[PDB]
Amino acid sequence: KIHEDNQKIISKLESLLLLKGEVESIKKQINRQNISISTLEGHLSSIMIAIPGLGKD
Amino acid sequence: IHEDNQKIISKLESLLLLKGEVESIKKQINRQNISISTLEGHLSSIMIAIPGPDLKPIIGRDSGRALAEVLKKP
Amino acid sequence: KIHEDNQKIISKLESLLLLKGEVESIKKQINRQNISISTLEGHLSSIMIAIPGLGKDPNDPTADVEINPDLKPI
Amino acid sequence: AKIHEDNQKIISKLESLLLLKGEVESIKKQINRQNISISTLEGHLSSIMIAIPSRGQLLKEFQLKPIGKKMSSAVGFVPDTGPASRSVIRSIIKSSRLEEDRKRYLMTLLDDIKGANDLAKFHQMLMKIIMK
Amino acid sequence: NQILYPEVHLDSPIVTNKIVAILEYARVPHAYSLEDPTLCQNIKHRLKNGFSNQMIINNVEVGNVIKSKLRSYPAHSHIPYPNCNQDLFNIEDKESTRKIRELLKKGNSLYSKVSDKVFQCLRDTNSRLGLGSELREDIKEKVINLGVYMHSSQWFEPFLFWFTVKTEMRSVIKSQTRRHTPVFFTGSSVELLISRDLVAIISKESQHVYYLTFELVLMYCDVIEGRLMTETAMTIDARYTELLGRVRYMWKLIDGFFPALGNPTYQIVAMLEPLSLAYLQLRDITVELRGAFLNHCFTEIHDVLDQNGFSDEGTYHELIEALDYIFITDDIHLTGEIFSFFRSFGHPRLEAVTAAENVRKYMNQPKVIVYETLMKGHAIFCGIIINGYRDRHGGSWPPLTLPLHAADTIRNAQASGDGLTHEQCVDNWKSFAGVKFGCFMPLSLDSDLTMYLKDKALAALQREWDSVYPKEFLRYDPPKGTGSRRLVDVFLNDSSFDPYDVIMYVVSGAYLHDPEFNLSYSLKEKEIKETGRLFAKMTYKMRACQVIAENLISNGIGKYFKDAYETVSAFITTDLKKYCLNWRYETISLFAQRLNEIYGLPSFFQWLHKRLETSVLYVSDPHCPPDLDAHIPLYKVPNDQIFIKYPMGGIEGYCQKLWTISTIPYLYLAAYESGVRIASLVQGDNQTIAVTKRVPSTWPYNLKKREAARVTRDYFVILRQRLHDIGHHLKANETIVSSHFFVYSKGIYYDGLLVSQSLKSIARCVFWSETIVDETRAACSNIATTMAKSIERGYDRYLAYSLNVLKVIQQILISLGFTINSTMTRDVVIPLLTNNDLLIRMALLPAPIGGMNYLNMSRLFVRNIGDPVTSSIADLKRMILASLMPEETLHQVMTQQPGDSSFLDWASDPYSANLVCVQSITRLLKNITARFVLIHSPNPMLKGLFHDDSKEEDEGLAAFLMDRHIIVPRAAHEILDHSVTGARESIAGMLDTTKGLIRASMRKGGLTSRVITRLSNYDYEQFRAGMVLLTGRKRNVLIDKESCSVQLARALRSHMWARLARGRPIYGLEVPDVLESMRGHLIRRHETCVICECGSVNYGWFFVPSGCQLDDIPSRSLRSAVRIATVYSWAYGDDDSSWNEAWLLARQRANVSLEELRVITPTSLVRVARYTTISNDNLSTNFIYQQGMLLGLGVLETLFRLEKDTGSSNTVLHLHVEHPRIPSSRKLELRAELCTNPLIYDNAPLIDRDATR
DSSP: HHHHHHHHHHHHHHHHHHHHHHHHHHHHHHHHHHHHHHHHHHHTTTTTEEOOSSSSO | OOHHHHHHHHHHHHHHHHHHHHHHHHHHHHHHHHHHHHHHHHTTTSBOOOOEEEEEEOOOOOSSHHHHHBBBBO | OOOHHHHHHHHHHHHHHHHHHHOOOOOOOOHHHHHHHHHHHHHHHHHHHOOOOTSSSOGGGGGOOOSSOOOOOO | OHHHHHHHHHHHHHHHHHHHHHHHHHHHHHHHHHHHHHHHHHHHHHHHOOOOOOOOOOSSOOOOOOOOSSSSSSOOOOSSSSHHHHHHHHHHTSSSSHHHHOOOHHHHHHHHHHHHHHHHHHHHHHHHHHHH | OOOOOOOSSOOOOBBHHHHHHHHHTTTTOOOOOOOOOHHHHHHHHHHTTOOOOOOHHHHHHHHHHHHHHHHTTTEEOOOTTTTTTTHHHOOOTTTTHHHHHHHHHHHHHHHHHHHHHHHHHHHHHHHHHTTEEEEEEOHHHHHTHHHHHEEEHHHHHHHHHHHHHHHHHHHHHHHHOOOOOOOOOEEEEEEEEEESSSSEEEEETTTTEEEOHHHHHHHHHHHHHHHHHHHHHHHHHHGGGHHHHHHHHHHHHHHHHHHHOOTTHHHHHHHHHHHHHHHHHHHHHSSSSSHHHHHHHHHHHHHHHHHHHHHHHHHHHHHHHHHHHHHSSSSSSTTTTGGGGGGOOOOOBBBBHHHHHHHHHHHHHEEEEEEEHHHHHHHHHHHHHHHHHHHHHHTTOOOEOOOOOHHHHHHHHHTTTTOOOHHHHTTGGGGGGEEOOOOOOOOOOOOOOOOTTTTOOOOSSSSSSSSSSOOGGGOOOOOOSSSOSBBBHHHOOSSSSSSHHHHHHTTTOSSSTTTTTTEEEOOSSSOOSSSOOOEEEHHHHHHHHHHHHHEEEHTHHHHHHOOOEEEEEEEEEEOOHHHHHHHEEEEEEEEHHHHHHHHHHOOOTTTTHHHHTTTTTEEOOOTTTSSOOSOOOOOSSSSTTTEEEESSSSOSSSSSHHHHHHHHHHHHHHHHHHHHHHEEEESSEEEEEEEEEEEEEEEEEHHHHHHHHHHHHHHHHHHHHHHHHHTOOOOOTTOESSSSSSEEESOEEETTEEETTTHHHHHHHHSSSSSSOOOOOHHHHHHHHHHHHHHHHHHOOHHHHHHHHHHHHHHHHHHHSSOOTTOOOOOHHHHHHHHHHHHHHHSSSSSGGGGOOOOOOOTTTTTTTTTTHHHHHHHHHHHHHHSSSSSSSHHHHTOOOOOOOOOEEEEESSOOOOOSSOOOOOHHHHHHHHHHHHOOOOGGGGGSSSSSTTTHHHEEEEHHHHHHSSHHHHHHHHHHHHHHHHHHHHHHHHSSSHHHHHHHHHHHHHHHHHHHHHHTTTHHHHHHHHHHHHHHHOOOOTTTTOOOOOHHHHHHHHHHHHHHTOOOOSOOOOOOOOHHHEEEEEESOOHHHHHHHHHHOEEEEEOOSSOOBSSOOOOHHHHHHHHHHHHHHTTTTSSSSHHHHHHHHHTTTOOOHHHHHHHOOTTHHHHTTTTTTTEETTTOOOOHHHHHHHHHHHHHHHHTTSSSBSSOOOOEEEEEEEEOOOOOOOOOOOSSSSOOOOOOOOOOOOOSSSOOO
């Protein structure tokens, strides 16, 4: 029964080890979006403002 | 030993509860990924070329009233 | 056999203890992310009040100042 | 007893994973707060850039047009174009500390020169004489 | 009114449409052509309708007289205003100018009597100081024959004609204010008609006809008189020999260009001001900086000649050769004298459409700016504010909120309290992207009143904007105007004025929805530019908000913005005139938000652009009418003619400090990118940037200037790029870069030398002065001031004194014989004109002792003389010793009839000698009008400052201070200046009444008829008092000849003040004269005569080496209370009884006790002066020694004036020098209740621990 319980512990530990790979996939997706914010911040740094010639009213 | 093994299985069931939370994290990153992609689509629209490339975007005053005067007619 | 199974349980448990360094790594990426959003909000804050009529109805963005310069006529 | 001692080591590692449970839950709150922050940022960004005129147009010569080597400016004088440059070179000869016969000889040489590049060669030769 | 005269000098623009309107009402044909024919339609419409008034009927008869005279001349041709200038600069008629010729010939006779003795007195003065050996021989012939040189000039015969026409026209204006028809006066070559509005001149030989208005006559008189005085001054003085010929050729050349070119000649005249700087830049050491700006000037002159039709290659080359003859000279000091001849040609005629289309072009231009450069300048701006608040508050950071994304350098500097450099601000410009300052600048508005009293014209309402145009020039009847015209009239008559109410009128947003807001333009009075310049007029509340906004910027944040190796600098001069048109809302917005956060006012500093973007602007001149059939509101008016419909820009002025403090960060950004150091100086529309780089000391002088020029050129390119990125468009051709010179207010600075315009003040030395009544004394004081200013800028001293005497004699003769005053009775004119010696003695006697000479011989050498009475008596003794004036005149000075003045008049003027009828009458009229309008003002800011019984309190205070056993008049002046009396006098003095408030007080009746009759006749009283003084025969036996001037001045002050003083002593007013005390000796070689002969060892030592080339290289009220306590404790003694009176006087300004009050209360000389070593060791009275050093510098300047270098010997110069307690007899009347007005009274003692300030 103790041997049966130990195999159940091993099976749950392998399930948590499969969860680790999904957590690492979260890290890659967070890092990819961080670059996307960074390149958008560069383009808002390079904005030129246009002023019209005559006021409307 | 058997009583200790039931305690170990009891804590392992609590540790398996985190899988729904990690999927909840994944949906939030997916929701942000749509939000950034719409902003990148909005950002690429007002980009033009400048003679002299640089590709600096230009924002108008009210809705783009100044852009009819400054820009070259296509 | 049971003692050999305990060594396997500890061996699989070691990599789960190493997950804490990865979880702390996510914390640093979120901290870097909220600074990067804060740059965008700082750029949005300056552009909105420099260009008039762009505030998207916030009741006069220039008027966000504090009012106690020994004035108080109201 | 050794197997029981190992099981207590199993329990202590599982409690350490339970301490990690709260920290991962704290990450989900910060990602949720960032999505609200970027959505309000999206609403303000969508309000601003509605112009939508990745190239469609060009500016109609609003640039500074930086100065050429031939053209004169406040940085320096370079001879170019027609009538004004000859008058400027003549004024530099007449205002100089040179001898009068040398100034008259340079007037004769300046009246001889016709080309625009040869006017530039005279000006570099003229400034060499003034410096010497 | 009988107290207002027509204006002597021109303070108004020249408008073509006025001349066209008069000549079309008079129906006279004319040759003018208008760019807008609108007036030329409207008049016709009125003449189609039959509209007429008194001015139309009066002008028909004048035109009929002109047509009846022009029937006699068949081939007559009218010439317009510019094209006739060469004729009208040279016009003479012998028959028409007889009386002024006889008057000036009599002046030549009197000066020929006294000129030799004037020369002898000046020669003795020169020989006392040791310069007698170096006196030039030509100076004698120039002094004796000065009138002959004045009368031999070519502008004398023009000046007599134009002075006659001006004086006869002024008689017509005042007399008409019988129906006599003006008739022509047939001269030898000129036929003349003078009316109130028109002068018709017909030349009999050429048959040329000229029609002129009053403004043109005033302009021609000023131009010809300035040319006459300037040519006389250059002919007499020997240092201006070549400049005389060059400016004569300039006059001939431009006067030749006037008939053919016309009004575009003034563009060449305005181009004469860049050309001197360009020809001075031609002599630079550096390589390509010589002919940079001359190329732009020559290109623009070629463009001016090409556009008008003179497209010939021969003409331009001859003009270049002529300009090369005029502007090339060897002396640097004579280069900048061409700036003095800038106004010698006249002023262009103007029209509103050209200025309107220029501002329309500039303010309706689209722009694209860059966000990054704007944010970098914003980061530098924030860094300057942070460093200023750290410097004034002990290193503490101001209240601000850094964003989350701020750099670690900025956050650690905020935590550790460390200042920020410019590099940290530019590199981390994203750290200042979302900062928000706290409120740390107070709004002090109830403590200042100095600004609203300044007069500023107010525009009309928006509902009634056509009221400025008369019914005569309009096709429709304009609405009658009800708005007030001036700022001070609204401000004083305001029943409820609150300084915070207009700020609420901005912040609440009522200015954008105000129905009566209006801005208008008006043409400038004196601009050489043909387009001209404009000044703006606006309504009351918006002008008040403008004044309060500029005060808030000036008193607060702007005070933050004021500032084996050697250092070299090079200069950039730029113009800032058109920068205000270039500013927009997007560029200024972030800077205005930061000022809003600092001052705590929401949307206040953004007011100008938001108001201008929704309003229509127009240029207003009465003779230029709108092209409208009926009355139409401004928003429906088209964008043509004088109207600018929806401007984007800033008006000239009105936000200048904000634009300046926004502009400086971009200069610092270009400095950081170019790696140079900047010192920046801002003049009026001129900016000088000094670029500094460190250089080795071992390098020669040639290479260091090349290095400074190289880094200056690189900085200039980077600065042009960064100013273009925000949209200013610096336009590099107009700016100038130099390695030696820069221009500022005094003159040109050239490598430690000052190049000054000495001949400008001589051109400003004219007859009469800008007063509403013609006074002789103010005119003579103006002559003395102009001659003294010319002496300080480098003119010769003795020649200026002789010209001053000649001009005083001529001014007295014009004031007696050729005047429009009807109060000049024959009882004073005939005795003065028949007796020559009486008039000469009146002209030569100094004014502190009763004469009409306002220039002293000590004043020619030093700026400050101590006692005017003692200096005047010393000058009179010099004139007696030189036989210029008789001895008995001195006795007359000591037997003069005393005047009537109280203790208050003595305390206001401590050096007065109680003379009869000396005070300027315009000052008296302004003081009475200002006091009346400030007492009778219902303004709540003036509740208790001005009372009906103020004058009795002031006289009681003066009689309390100066009726003690010893009279000290200087200390009482200092007490009254810092008391409530001087506070009221300072508030009344800053209000300029001008003509308008004097007329308004005449309609109110504050000026009584006795006041008008008495103030109308004071010139006759001055001449009567002078005649009674000089004809009296009373002698005092205590007057010894060549006695001390100090004892004579004490006896004079005791005699004139004997009614008030009653024999008590007077202390603290006597000082020895500068010229009498000091004797000079020059040691060229072999010792001193004075030291060996007299044994005197009290002298100052001056040394000039040989072989040097001279030609080339708390609250204010608390401080007032402290000053009152200090002067009263010092002058009247200190004890227990005297400190009570000092506390009672000082309590009225600040809220302090007795113990707290005890605790808290405790030039042209430089040409020699760079080489001069002054040692004061052999001296043994600080004022006497300081004026001695100034006299020594003046003597060494006079010695080396005409010589280029010190020659072969060292120059050594020697200038030898030859109360327990006062108890109070009166008692203090004081005031029953202390005034609590915030301008004057300080409610809190504030910092009692700090005894400084």
